Design a binder for these strands. Sequence first.
RNA 1: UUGGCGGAAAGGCCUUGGGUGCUUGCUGGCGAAUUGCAAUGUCAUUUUGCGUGGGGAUAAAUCAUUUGUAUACGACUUAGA
RNA 2: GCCCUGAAAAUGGAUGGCGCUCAAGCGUGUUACCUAUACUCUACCGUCAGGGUUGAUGCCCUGACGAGUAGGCAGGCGUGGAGGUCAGUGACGAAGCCUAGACCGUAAGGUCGGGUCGAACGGCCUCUAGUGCAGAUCUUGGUGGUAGUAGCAAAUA
RNA 3: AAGCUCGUAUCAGUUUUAUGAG
RNA 4: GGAAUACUGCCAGCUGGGACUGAGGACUGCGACGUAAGUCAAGGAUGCUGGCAUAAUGGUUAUAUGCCGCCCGUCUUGAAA
RNA 5: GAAAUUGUUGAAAGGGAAGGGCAUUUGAUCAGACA
Lengths: 155, 106, 92, 127, 197, 61
Amino acid sequence: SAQKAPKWYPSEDVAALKKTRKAARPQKLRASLVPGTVLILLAGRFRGKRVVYLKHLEDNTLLISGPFKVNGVPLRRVNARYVIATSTKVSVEGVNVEKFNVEYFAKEIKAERVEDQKVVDKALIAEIKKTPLLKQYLSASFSLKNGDKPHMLKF
Amino acid sequence: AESHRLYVKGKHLSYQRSKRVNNPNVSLIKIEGVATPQDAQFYLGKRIAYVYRASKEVRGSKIRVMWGKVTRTHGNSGVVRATFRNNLPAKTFGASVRIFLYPSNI
Amino acid sequence: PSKNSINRPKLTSNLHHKVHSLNKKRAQRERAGLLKPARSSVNSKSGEIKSVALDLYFQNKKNSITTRTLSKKRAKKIERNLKYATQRKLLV
Amino acid sequence: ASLPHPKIVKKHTKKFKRHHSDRYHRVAENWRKQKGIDSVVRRRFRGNISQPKIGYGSNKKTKFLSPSGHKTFLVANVKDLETLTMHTKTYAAEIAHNISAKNRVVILARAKALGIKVTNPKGRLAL
Amino acid sequence: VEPVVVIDGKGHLVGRLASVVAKQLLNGQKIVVVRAEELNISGEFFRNKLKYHDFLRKATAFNKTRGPFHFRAPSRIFYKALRGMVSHKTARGKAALERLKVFEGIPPPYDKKKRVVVPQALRVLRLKPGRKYTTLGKLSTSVGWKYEDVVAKLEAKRKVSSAEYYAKKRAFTKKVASANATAAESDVAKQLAALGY
Amino acid sequence: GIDHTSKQHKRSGHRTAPKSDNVYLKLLVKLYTFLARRTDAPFNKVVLKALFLSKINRPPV
RNA sequence: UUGGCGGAAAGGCCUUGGGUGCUUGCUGGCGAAUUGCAAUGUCAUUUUGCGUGGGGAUAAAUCAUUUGUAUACGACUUAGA
RNA sequence: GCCCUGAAAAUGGAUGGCGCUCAAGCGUGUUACCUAUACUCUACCGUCAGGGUUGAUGCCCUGACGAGUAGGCAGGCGUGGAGGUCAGUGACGAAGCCUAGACCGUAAGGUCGGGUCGAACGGCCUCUAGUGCAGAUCUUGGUGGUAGUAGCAAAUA
RNA sequence: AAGCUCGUAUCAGUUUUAUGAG
RNA sequence: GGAAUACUGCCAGCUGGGACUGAGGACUGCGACGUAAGUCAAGGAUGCUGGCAUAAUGGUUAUAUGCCGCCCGUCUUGAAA
RNA sequence: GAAAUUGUUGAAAGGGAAGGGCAUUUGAUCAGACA
Ligand SMILES: [Mg+2]
Ligand SMILES: [Mg+2]
Ligand SMILES: [Mg+2]
Ligand SMILES: [Mg+2]
Ligand SMILES: [Mg+2]
Ligand SMILES: [Mg+2]
Ligand SMILES: [Mg+2]
Ligand SMILES: [Mg+2]
Ligand SMILES: [Mg+2]
Ligand SMILES: [Mg+2]
Ligand SMILES: [Mg+2]
Ligand SMILES: [Mg+2]
Ligand SMILES: [Mg+2]
Ligand SMILES: [Mg+2]
Ligand SMILES: [Mg+2]
């Protein structure tokens, strides 16, 4: 015997957790996040690009589109904390986004993405064409210049 | 365009300290364009990155990052306090850091 | 800076040269292969027995100036223990 | 595959070294209390070494636990090994330093059959 | 926000300029100081000369070559005033000091660069009118600096060249302003005025 | 800091446990500890207290 | 590629003539996606390394010997195809 | 009230230094700001106290405390030898020694890997003592710097 | 440190009231 | 004569931003919204998602940087002195 | 076949001592956990 056996042994019956009193409640977005708003992307592959916010998804994400014909950003999800909501707004009542959801964006090109992109971008472009220089504004990328102060800049 | 910058520039001033002892767990950061605590309140909670270069490649890059965040203001002149996951080396007193715009309240 | 030439940087230039020299020396050692490989490499010894005597014995079986030598006594003991392990492997 | 435990916290990971054990070869690093009446270390002046005390004591629910979450139990043979046949999730067996390779083979085989984790399964068994 | 800040030292008070520059160097800003011979010290010339002569008294008795070194040039006087405010025996202090260059006059290439001022160190903004002050070039010449005339001649030549450059620049600016002022009635100009530009 | 009015970490005392190694005496102490806790009987309290005394404090009768 | 200027540490400033691109001054058409909801997500001169190659030029210093205007020893000052 | 004189020696030096003149000086007022092992909240260690309880000097719940020389009390770590036990370890390698490797203890220490080594040694319950070193101008033995240094120049060669 | 008792028990580097001293 | 405002104070008024913490581990209790079954922020954190799956986090070791740190024992009020 | 002390090799530091504490960078090196 290289070591004496202990007199007492802890039990291996793992106890269950106590009943947690933490209910899940819907997210309250910022007052500036209204569908149809132009958003600046702050991070990711499409950082510094201006897109259009379309729909709030069940996973606390925002459905956005470029539109893909204007600046090459497809129908994607974004996190609301990584965007800047500007003041520019376009109408979205002509856009049908009742199909897209988390199950749609699950990843376990399919060309159903392409078809839905064409259908959504048609109405988005129709709404965009009414405002002058809005298409050029959405195609241009955002960046900070010398001496820009984000705590003073309006959006 | 000619610029792609999505961050504000800052300088790592020093550690939190008294006259004869310092606390490396807290760093003092001076953000460009900020001169008052009222203006510094905008940047609370923003991510800070210290980006530096090393000669040996690690995971496909020669560029290494130390992450942290803004926690509170400091003084009357727009200096803030920041905490990083690993404390800054203290050879970086006077070096540049990047204050990002996320998480965003705008 | 030096009191004889205050406009010329001295300490920063010395540190920059030192950093550059250390980087070049490390790169030269890596290219010479004097550094341990990655942990997931096939030739990594991570989590395994590290023994100069066993490494020398197996290098001699496979077939500059070094301080790593294998004694005849240890080599004979290695051969004997390898015969024991081979007999066990044959039995199972 | 151990018992669930809180995150292990060590209050003082660094070793408590004896004063001037760096200064003199004849002074070993094993901790000794300074009994001098004028000792700056004993009087606890700023800038000196820290001394062991009960405040540094570890959490009783994480005490004696290895990083894998087990308690180490030294074993010399199969009979010592089979003491842990029911306390598998809390204890891991460690073979004693003086067990021969021929017996370590048997111990490892029996431990694998019984599902008992072995702390040092590579000892003396290089191929 | 400039990578290098060039400060015209004329009309500044030495102590306050030294304080602000030392803080900038510690924060990690590269600074060049020009025209150090035109710096000012508050107080009378005899007082400042007396203070420098006390400094001259200070020396190591058993070997003068080990003692305090008394550099006579105005740039070196300013450098002493700043080294007294930088913790210069540490690596951090040495690194801060190595972000600083001080010159008498404006040598190249800084003669063709923009030069700024520090309002909190300016004499006309700080000192009460009527208080006496001292010029660093005269003080340095009285304590042994021997290059005041050479610097004056070179500065005069530089001023002539800079005046010619400014005359050409002012003519071009007048031409540009004339060409811009005639387009203030266009619809583009009206839209820019509506947007504030 | 605090200005303590009384001593700190003061033991109550009162002869908690017997100093003997008699296993039968320890069994009797166990039984009367149980009785004194679960009966609220002053007799059981007195007997339990007397079982802790030393030889010079338990004179014969 | 034409010419002028700049010596404070000039090493930069201005200018002539074609060439070759770009131009968001204005109007259009195609492309972007999957980096999967963020992870610096790598973007800037110089390279005493090599390979290709057209050209350019073919030295000294020290030891040893030697002098004494030099010298404790080094050092110094001379001479030798 | 502030300012100047209102006495001073002897290496070169001090509002701590730089320096500061509508001050960065003096008197006062109003705010903001910096930070102690102090105060407040939380976690963890230990001690003490109060309750509960048919490995019970254990377990569970709650609360408050923690400076220390001489001195007191308590719990522990380590060593030689002895009785008992593990039908303990060991020539497939005991003890010892070395170790840029691993782990557990607040600590005294304990455990594992590798190398060297070549015959004995350990865990636990107890017994016993010539049982723990940094010092004593300590004892014995061994070894440095000084240092290739001082010097090996009386007695004619 | 040990016993015995008692435990709205025993009190207190404090105040108050009455009464002295200055 | 009619108001407003400043100052001081109160609300068991509403609401935005930031930081540290998540101890406990079946149920029991006190409450709230509810006719109702039930629900809840009420006797201590859960839910959703991404990347990596190894030297990446982490440890050790050699050093660098910022700040702190006088040589121990003994004996003397007291010792750098 | 220990230490003091020494040689060689490799790595590192060094502008009038070195050593220690807290924290992190860099170089080197390494264990666990891998269903
Ligand atoms: Mg002179
Ligand atoms: Mg306390
Ligand atoms: Mg002051
Ligand atoms: Mg005042
Ligand atoms: Mg052995
Ligand atoms: Mg003895
Ligand atoms: Mg000794
Ligand atoms: Mg002693
Ligand atoms: Mg001695
Ligand atoms: Mg000699
Ligand atoms: Mg003779
Ligand atoms: Mg690390
Ligand atoms: Mg100190
Ligand atoms: Mg021998
Ligand atoms: Mg040795």
